[PDB]
Amino acid sequence: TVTITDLARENVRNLTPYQSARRLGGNGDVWLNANEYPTAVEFQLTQQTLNRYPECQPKAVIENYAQYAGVKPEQVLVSRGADEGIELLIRAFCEPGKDAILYCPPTYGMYSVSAETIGVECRTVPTLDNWQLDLQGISDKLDGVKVVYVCSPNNPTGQLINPQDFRTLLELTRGKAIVVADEAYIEFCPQASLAGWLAEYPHLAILRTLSKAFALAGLRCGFTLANEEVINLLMKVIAPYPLSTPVADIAAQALSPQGIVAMRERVAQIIAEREYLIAALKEIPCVEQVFDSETNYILARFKASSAVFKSLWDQGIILRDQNKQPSLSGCLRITVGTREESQRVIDALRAEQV
Amino acid sequence: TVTITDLARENVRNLTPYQSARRLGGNGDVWLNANEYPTAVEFQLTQQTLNRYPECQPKAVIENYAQYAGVKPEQVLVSRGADEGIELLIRAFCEPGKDAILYCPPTYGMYSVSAETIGVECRTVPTLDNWQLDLQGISDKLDGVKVVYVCSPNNPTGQLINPQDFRTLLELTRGKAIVVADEAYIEFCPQASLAGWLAEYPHLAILRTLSKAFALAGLRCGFTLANEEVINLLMKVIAPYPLSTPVADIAAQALSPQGIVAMRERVAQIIAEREYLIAALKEIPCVEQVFDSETNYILARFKASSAVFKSLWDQGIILRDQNKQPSLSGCLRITVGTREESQRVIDALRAEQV
Ligand SMILES: Cc1ncc(COP(=O)(O)O)c(CN)c1O
Ligand SMILES: Cc1ncc(COP(=O)(O)O)c(CN)c1O
Known about the structure:
Helix content of chain A: 25-40%
Radius of gyration of chain A: 21 Å
Largest sheet of chain A: 7 strands, mixed
Number of helices of chain A: 12
PDB class: transferase
Chains A, B: histidinol phosphate aminotransferase
Strand content of chain A: 15-25%
Bound molecules: 4'-deoxy-4'-aminopyridoxal-5'-phosphate
CATH superfamily of the largest domain in chain A: Type I PLP-dependent aspartate aminotransferase-like (Major domain)
Oligomer: homodimer
Assembly: dimeric
Largest interface: A-B, 85 and 85 residues
Distance between the termini of chain A: 58 Å
Keywords: Aminotransferase, HisC, Histidine Biosynthesis, Pyridoxal Phosphate, Montreal-Kingston Bacterial Structural Genomics Initiative, bsgi, Structural Genomics, transferase
Entry title: crystal structure of L-histidinol phosphate aminotransferase with pyridoxal-5'-phosphate
Structural class of chain A: alpha/beta
C-alpha cells in the first residue's frame, strides 16, 4: 500500500518548516521576539471595491514606494513581504537540482528554507568572527551559484556589512549571479542602503519590507528593488494577483508623504530606545557582551543564556533564542520596544546574575 | 558578455505569463470578464494590530470556513486565493523535471502556468465533445503524474463533471496521484461538491475561493480542503505568513453565520439573473448556441465571434474571449452581472446579427 506521504517530494518529506512561531497567547505580556514595532499604527479601508480583483502591481503602492526609495517605478516590485521576494528570486534564477543559492550564517533563515523547499542547493560560507563577509571563501564557492543573499544590516547580529566588501562581492558575481541585499532593516540606517548603486550593477537586487520600521507586519507587504531587466523577469514568475486590495489600500496610505514622516519618527524613537537598552544591558551582571546594532534589535551574549531565556519567558518576556545559531552560542536577540518594555527586560535580567 | 537574462532559468525565459489582464480603465462601464460578483459588499477593519505578524493560519478564518464547508478544521488550509492552492499542491507533490501534472482542456489556465513556472511537465488529455472527462485517455497517460486537476463546474464551459466519472478518476489515481477538484464555482451548485467524499479518498483535495459567490476577489483569499495528511504536507511548503491581518479580519466576518446567509442570497440572485440571460441569448440572431451553466458565467458560440467581441469591447462591454481555447472556436464567456448589465449585453448583441 502507498501512503499519501509516499507521493510527496523527498525534499518536502525531509525538510523542517521555518521556526518563526513561538507563541504563548495570553501568557506573555512583553513581546520582543519578532522585531515588530511595539505599538499599533491604525489604518482604515478607503476602497470598497472588494468584489473586484486588484491590479497585479497596485500603481499607487509602486509609485509611492519608488518615490520614497528614490528609485524609478520600473525598478520596483511589490510582493507578500520580503519573504516572497526571496522566493521569487530563486524561482526565476535557480534551476532546481542544478543551480544553488549562497548565504552566510548566522543570518535570516528563510533564504535556506525557500531554496530547500523549492529544491535548490544551499551553499553556505559563514561570515568572519565579526560577522563581516568571508570574501575569499565566497570567491572559491561560486560555481553553480545563481543567487547570493546578504542581509545588511544583518539579522540577528545587527551590524552593517562593509560597503567596500559589497563592492567586491558584486565584482565576483558579475555575469554569474544575482546579489540580493536584504534591507529589511535599512530604515534604521538609511544612509547605508545600496539602492543608489543600481545603475552600476545590473545583477544587484534589494529586499525591502513594511514589517519593521513601517510597523505594518500585519499587512504582509514587501518590495524588491532592482534594474528593470531583473524586475521584469521576476514579474514572469509572480502570482497574477499577489496583493489584496485592503493591503494595497493601506500600504499606499502608509507610503504617503505624511506616512513617511511618521515612519521616520518611529525610527528615531526606536534608535533612541535602542541606545538606552544597549547602555543598560552592558552593566547587567548576567550579560557578557552586547553587540553593536544598526537595527531595531540587539544581540547579546549571556551567562547561562538558556536559563535566562526560560526565566524571562516564564515571566511573560518573550525574546528570540539564538543559542543554536552558528557562532552565536549563549546569545539572545532582543527586539527594541517601548521604554517600559526595555525596563521590564532590564529589571528581569538584574534579577538573575548568579 | 553575459546578460541578466542569460542567468534566468530556461523555462522562465521561454514561458508566457498568464493572460488574466485585459483592462481599459475608464473606457469600459460593463465588466463581465472575470467572473466577479457585480456589486461591492462593504467590510471594515476591526483589528488594529497591524504592527504585529498574523497567525500563519488565522484560527477564526479556518474555523468559520470549516463550519461553512462541513469539514473538520484540520482538513482546511487558507491561502492567497485558490491560485496559491494550485501552486502548493505542485510544490509539495511534483518533483521538477521528474513528475507531471495532468489537466483536461479547455479549462482554467493557472494549472499549466504554475507547473510550467515551477518546472513540472504538463500532461494534457482534452475533455470529450461535451466537456466530460476522457477517462480512457486519462487512464493511459498517468505515468509520472502526481497531481490531476479537474475543474467542476468547469471554467470556461460551465458544466459539472459527472460524479460517476470522478469516482473512476479517483480509482485510477489511488496510490498514484492527488486528484484536485477545483470548486471555485461550487457555491452556485453546492449539492455537487465532493467535500463530503474526503473520508473515502485519501488523495482527494478541493480548491475553494472567496473570489466569486462570496464577492471578495479583492481579498485574495482561498482554501484547500483535504484529509489531514495532505493538509499537513501542504503546510510544510506554504509561506510562514500567507494571509494578512486585514484579509483574515474581513474574511472571518464574511464567513460568519450572517455572512453565509448573505452569500447564499448572492448565489440565488446570480442564478436567477443567469437564467434570464441564458433564455434571452438563445433568441439573439448572432448567437449560435448557449451552453448549460451551473456557475456565474455563460459560454456561448457566436457568428463572427471576434467581430462581436471587439464590437462590444468598444462599447464598454467587456467579456472574455475563448476563441483560442481548444474546442472553443467562436465562443465568448459572459459573466453574470446585474439585470442592467445583462440588458446591455442583450441589446448590444441584437445590434449585430448580420
Ligand atoms: C532579515 C529579514 N528579511 C526579510 C524579512 C521578511 O520580511 P517580511 O515580514 O516583508 O515577509 C524578515 C522578517 N523577520 C527579516 O528579519
Ligand atoms: C476555475 C478557477 N479556479 C481558481 C481560481 C482562483 O481563484 P482565486 O481568486 O481564490 O486565487 C479562479 C479565478 N478565475 C478560477 O476561475
